[PDB]
Ligand binder design. Structure first.
Ligand SMILES: CCCCCCSC[C@H](NC(=O)CC[C@H]([NH3+])C(=O)O)C(=O)NCC(=O)O
Ligand SMILES: CCCCCCSC[C@H](NC(=O)CC[C@H]([NH3+])C(=O)O)C(=O)NCC(=O)O
Lengths: 219, 221
């Protein structure tokens, strides 16, 4: 089993739990709770850059998020059929991580920039991202983002549509094909199971989890 | 068919690694330099930008945006992404550490004047103690001339590129990392990269204040 090393939070390991889950892979977590929990990993050389996410899979100690994602996605057939499909996928999931980054790091934001930053995430989701994934679905009419078969593009988009809902549920309201997608993916057996309570899907990041972040990562 | 066509403004910024990668692959490409907010609104209005942003690269009938979509595609097409999935994973780990440092250096010129000095000192710490030791370590681990699978890959082109920006920052940083020195020489010495390093190629100069203002004027920031 893949073993995921992170603290017990969404952070930069969430899209990996979803991709693994969506692919039917069961995995272990090992939760770092302390700065010295992290230092242990560092000292045992388990971390190429002294950072996590790290994931033990197939004898490798893979750090860097995209390293983990790209590897899962190919291994489990979720990276399209050819390089032209990977390229469309990549283009999509990169627009998505760019928005996912903005939202991953709102709680770390200096508090005086927080208002200006929400407003602009909302504005980008309305004007920039959503219309772009709506154009895609509308262009081919198909159930999936690419090559008419499930891929990680569908996993990462739907995940982000969950966070966009937590932010403001009005936002997706005029992107009906996104709504349709959100639904269909969420009713895929493995994702439905992942979205159920007691799964390893993790909650929004509250306060103490943030404070648990600063302590472990020393920031 | 058609040379790939790169769409950016006339600066390093987010298009430089692509320029590097395509040259190292010995692919001839065209550039179209955005000079103004108008030129960029035109690409927006013509539908050419999936997120209304550049880099964009027209290649193989696609309008690829997002540096990493473009990179991955070029890396794979020209066999510079390793020979399998386990290899692509080590390439991705390395080049993502590289991009983390690259981002830090790319964006330093945008940093507020009050932060710039603290930030640069932490770039220099991270280079000496985090990034460089991890790449020396890789090289030491196998003694081979390339970072992965013992043939040339984007892992080496990106790292070397970053060795040249780290050098501009402070040539003294790489000094306790001999194997990195050797990489940089050797890679710089491949025909394709050597030719790209020569005067009058598309390689771009470090961004001065004026280019930063054109960055300002164009992207509206
Ligand atoms: C909402 C914020 C989430 C919590 C903090 C950020 S993730 C923890 C952090 N890891 C990284 O930033 C890795 C970044 C890397 N690009 C990746 O995607 O793996 C770390 O080990 N930091 C330790 C260090 O770099 O010293
Ligand atoms: C110090 C400045 C260096 C220049 C960096 C900005 S490059 C221009 C910017 N592009 C992007 O942020 C694309 C980001 C994307 N994740 C990528 O990597 O391609 C843009 O078109 N922005 C226009 C917009 O967002 O509307």
């Amino acid at each position: 089993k893949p073993k995921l090393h992170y603290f017990n939070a969404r952070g930069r390991m969430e899209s990996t739990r979803w991709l693994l889950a969506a692919a039917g892979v069961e995995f272990e977590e090992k939760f770092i709770k302390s700065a010295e929990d992290l230092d242990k990993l560092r000292n045992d050389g388990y971390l190429m850059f002294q950072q996590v996410p790290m994931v033990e899979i197939d004898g490798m100690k893979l750090v860097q998020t995209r390293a983990v994602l790209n590897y899962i996605a190919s291994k489990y057939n979720l990276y399209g059929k050819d390089i032209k499909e990977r390229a469309l996928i990549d283009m999509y999931i990169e627009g998505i991580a760019d928005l996912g980054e903005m939202i991953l790091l709102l709680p770390v934001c200096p508090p005086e920039e927080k208002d200006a930053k929400l407003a602009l995430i909302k504005e980008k989701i309305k004007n920039r991202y959503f219309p772009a994934f709506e154009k895609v679905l509308k262009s081919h009419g198909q159930d999936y983002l690419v090559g008419n078969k499930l891929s990680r593009a569908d996993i990462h988009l739907v995940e982000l549509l969950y966070y966009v809902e937590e932010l403001d549920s009005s936002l997706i309201s005029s992107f009906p094909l996104l709504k349709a997608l959100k639904t269909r993916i969420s009713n895929l057996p493995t994702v439905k199971k992942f979205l159920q309570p007691g799964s390893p899907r993790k909650p929004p990041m509250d306060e103490k989890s943030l404070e648990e972040a600063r302590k472990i990562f020393r920031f």
